[PDB]
């Protein structure tokens, strides 16, 4: 079935703001002598060079 009424402004924004993203947690790693931030998931790979750091 179809929406019967036009959802007001307060009701639209209340639900919309739940559609967000969570910023990743970054740890500092030292590659080739410079410190770059990589997620702790990719910590081990970045030490072996498997992770490309732009």
């Amino acid at each position: 079935a179809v929406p019967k009424r036009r959802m007001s402004r307060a009701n639209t924004r209340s639900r919309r703001a739940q559609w967000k993203a969570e910023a990743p947690g970054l740890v500092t790693v030292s590659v080739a002598g410079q410190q770059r931030k990589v997620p702790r998931r990719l910590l081990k790979a970045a030490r072996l060079g498997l992770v490309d750091l732009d």
Binding site: R41, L42, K44, A45, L48, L50, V51, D52
Partner: protein, 118 residues
């Protein structure tokens, strides 16, 4: 090993079995491959049970390995280099390293190797 609890990997039971064999062939031929993470997780209890067969090198085991990997060239590599190399280490022949996510579909990616340390 323990069958996949969830729904299968390639989209069917038959496709998963062909998927695992091809990956194991590529892993032994090269040494390290980079695949989607749930694929690499399902490879370990499979690709390293074959090395157990090559560890006890015998004609019977060679028939067991050849009934999965289907590639005659790799079996010689498995039984002549990979086989005796791991003759002392019990279990844990492979290691899984997690890498960047794929750009297209954001699939998680993992690199599965063979332990070369000893």
């Amino acid at each position: 090993p323990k069958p996949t609890k969830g729904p299968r990997l390639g989209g069917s039971s038959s496709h998963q079995s062909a998927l695992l064999a091809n990956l194991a062939t590529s892993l032994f031929e090269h040494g390290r491959i980079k695949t989607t993470e749930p694929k690499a997780r399902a490879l370990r209890p499979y690709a390293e049970k074959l090395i157990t067969h090559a560890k006890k090198g015998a004609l019977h085991n060679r028939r067991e390995v050849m009934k999965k990997i289907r590639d005659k060239d790799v079996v010689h590599t498995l039984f002549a280099e990979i086989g005796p190399f791991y003759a002392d280490r019990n279990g844990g022949y492979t290691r899984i390293i997690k890498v960047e996510n794929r750009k297209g579909d954001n699939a998680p990616m993992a690199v599965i190797e063979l332990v070369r340390e000893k």
